[PDB]
Amino acid sequence: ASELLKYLTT
Amino acid sequence: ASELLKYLTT
Amino acid sequence: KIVSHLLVAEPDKLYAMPPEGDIKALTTLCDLADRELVVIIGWAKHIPGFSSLSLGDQMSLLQSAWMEILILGIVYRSLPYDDKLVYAEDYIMDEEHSRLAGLLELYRAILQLVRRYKKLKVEKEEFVTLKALALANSDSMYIEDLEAVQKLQDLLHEALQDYELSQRHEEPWRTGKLLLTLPLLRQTAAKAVQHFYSVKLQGKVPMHKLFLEMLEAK
Amino acid sequence: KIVSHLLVAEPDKLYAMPPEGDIKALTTLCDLADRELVVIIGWAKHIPGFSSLSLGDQMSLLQSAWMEILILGIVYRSLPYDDKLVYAEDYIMDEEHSRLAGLLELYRAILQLVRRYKKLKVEKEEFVTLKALALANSDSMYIEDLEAVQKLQDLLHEALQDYELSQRHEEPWRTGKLLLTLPLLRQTAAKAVQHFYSVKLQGKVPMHKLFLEMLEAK
């Protein structure tokens, strides 16, 4: 749900 | 006037 | 080599792109921060062994160390200037510009670290290995596998020391001297985080959501 | 040798001497702190070259680093215990005792440093040279002669490194590993200082005046 995990797995 | 300088120059 | 490796993964030069008051200054820094937050994350995955950590631990490190790594970017860019802070190559603040926009106390804090790094004559290679070391040495209270994080720390520390033990063998224990700046680094990052959370609370300043998410972790 | 030298200047074992509530706990720690503050100052003058600093600079260092040096004493004493904090050989707090007296968050912070030092198996000699290094590396914004303070830092760092490069040559870069704990040290000292200033403000707890004077510097 976090931007961090979004950016971490893009 | 400070305790520190008191203790530092005892 | 890890240094050559970590080096060419660093982003290329950043440029500020922002009613010329204090609220427009903060927004320029807040969106410069958010833009570089995005790039730390891309860069972090090039740190050997970082991506082999569980994702919760990758996030725990980043959540602890993100401001330290930004500060080290500002510091590196600021080394050639005369008591100026370069948040970007476009955007270079001095004391009076800082004081007016309410950033004076933060500005003085970072300058102390800047002047310490100027006397050490720290190089781009050392900034890079130090950024990595701050990440692995973040001291998150939320690491699941401390042993894997310690292995990474040992690896990045070995690199820094073996880089120093050859390229800069004229100066002994130059490794430790760089490590000895890390407390001030963490301290300064603590001031930046509180100030920027202080302008978060005020609400007069808008913040791209990645930046906000990092700030509430802290 | 500076280590043997700095070692036998350390005070001998401290013993707590204090309505068994939270207000009696804080008072025991507050007066244990004040009693050891007095002893840091006696000990500081045995640090080679510390007394050749101008008195303003001796005070600027002590005012910045005092909590870090206390924390390192608690840490050293706490190494043999099972998740206990020994503020004194008399006085050993655990999680529940901590939580009740409002010290839980501070207790967890120090324990993280304790568990880091337990895994490093840090020795009394290293605590002593690290106490000294935290003092000279305090990053006071009020130093007049940064060069003399840096010389001291270089001296204490040399000592730590040359002590390690022989007594513990089985473990390479053990010096840097100890330096890498210093950020957490400063961080933890920051939490202790704020908590103890929080009980200063509340007024329900009495504090011998040397302790109070250190706390308002911070």
Task: Jot down its keywords.
heterotetramer; A: 10 residues; mainly alpha; 1 helix; 70% helix; 0% strand; C: 218 residues; Retinoid X Receptor; two-stranded antiparallel sheet; 2 strands; 67% helix; globular; transcription; ERR2; Transcription factor; BPA; tetrameric
Question: What would you say this structure looks like, in words?
Answer:
The complex is a heterotetramer, with 2 copies of chain A (10 residues) and 2 copies of chain C (218 residues). By secondary structure, chain A is mainly α. Helices cover 70% and strands 0% of the residues of chain A. Chain A has 1 helix and no strands. Chain A is elongated. In chain C, strands 1-2 form a two-stranded antiparallel ribbon. In chain C, β1 (85-86) and β2 form a beta hairpin. Chain C has a single domain (2-217), classed as Retinoid X Receptor (Orthogonal Bundle), CATH 1.10.565. In chain C, 45% of the residues are buried. With 218 residues, chain C is mainly α. In chain C, α2 crosses α10 (209-217) and α5 (104-120) runs antiparallel to α9 (182-202). The longest helix of chain C is centred in the first third of the chain and has 24 residues, at 55-78. Chains in contact: A-C, B-D, C-D. The C-D interface holds C 108, 112, 119, 133, 137, 139, 141, 150, 153-154, 157-158, 160-161, 173, 175-177, 179-180, 182-187, 190 and D 108, 112, 119, 133, 137, 139, 141, 150, 153-154, 157-158, 160-161, 173, 175-177, 179-180, 182-187, 190. Chains C, D: This is Steroid hormone receptor ERR2.
